[PDB]
Paper text:
The NS3/4A protease is an excellent target for developing DAAs against HCV, and protease inhibitors have been a key component of most combination therapies. This essential protease cleaves the HCV polyprotein into functional units necessary for viral replication and maturation. Structurally Asp168 is a critical residue that contributes to an active-site electrostatic network necessary for efficient inhibitor binding. We rationally designed HCV protease inhibitors that retain potency while fitting within the substrate envelope to avoid resistance, particularly against D168A, which confers high-level resistance to current HCV PIs.
The smallest cyclic ring in P4-1 resulted in an ∼2-fold potency increase compared to that of the parent compound, while further increasing the size of the cyclic ring system achieved a 2.5- to 4-fold increase in potency for the cyclopentyl (P4-3, P4-4, and P4-5) and cyclohexyl (P4-6) capping groups. The small cyclopropyl ring of P4-1 is able to fit in the S4 pocket better than the larger ring of P4-2. Most importantly, all of the P4 inhibitors had reduced vdW contacts with D168A relative to those of the parent compound, which likely underlies better potency against this RAS.
Residue numbers in the entry: 982 to 1179
Amino acid sequence: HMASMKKKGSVVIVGRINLSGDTAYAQQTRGEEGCQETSQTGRDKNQVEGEVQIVSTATQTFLATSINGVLWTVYHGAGTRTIASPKGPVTQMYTNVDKDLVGWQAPQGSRSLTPCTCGSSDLYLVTRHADVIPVRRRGDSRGSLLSPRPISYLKGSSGGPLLCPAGHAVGIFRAAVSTRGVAKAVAFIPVESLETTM
Ligand SMILES: COc1ccc2nc(C)c(O[C@@H]3C[C@H]4C(=O)N[C@]5(C(=O)NS(=O)(=O)C6(C)CC6)C[C@H]5/C=C\CCCCC[C@H](NC(=O)OC5(C)CC5)C(=O)N4C3)nc2c1
Ligand SMILES: [Zn+2]
């Protein structure tokens, strides 16, 4: 009934992939209880750092990546949800179900990756476990893993970046192509598709 209608909570930043130094590692910045509370209020007073955030809703967890001042992620994770911020929920500034893409203004304190213009096909996928996985680009939106592995290892990493050797953003991880549960290839939203939507 109209009286009891609920609203979906915000996407919440719950951690980050630290790429500051020589060793990549995940950091949690908010636990599940505080995540649920922040999703309901949409008010997140935590300091944000870095390029790759770990994000969560009430039911899903995935990644979000800042490129050119926009925090980008997948529509299949975030839907049309707002993101929590220090002054309340923030509405998406980009939404494209056809590309499986959404974006919000990048949070204060984040660092943005630069869009790649190298034209290189030797890529690196960053997962939610801070694994850096070499990927050979195979098309506009596809790459093959140099070392295949079960899809379990990639689950929860949509919204993460594919980077070039120079650390530029080449695309946003969207889907994993597997055979008998082994991921052989990935699909991603190319950064040019991001740059066009901007
Ligand atoms: C609803 O509106 C939509 C609009 C556009 C759209 N466009 C898609 C391509 C899309 O594809 C969905 C979600 C993707 C996923 O699972 N994305 C990862 C991930 O990690 N998600 S996640 O866990 O973070 C999670 C669920 C958010 C919390 C990166 C995958 C890691 C493991 C694969 C597991 C088996 C799943 C393997 C599967 N292959 C696959 O479709 O291959 C093809 C044929 C090349 C496509 C896959 O990858 N997807 C299935 N859905 C939408 C939904
Ligand atoms: Zn580059």
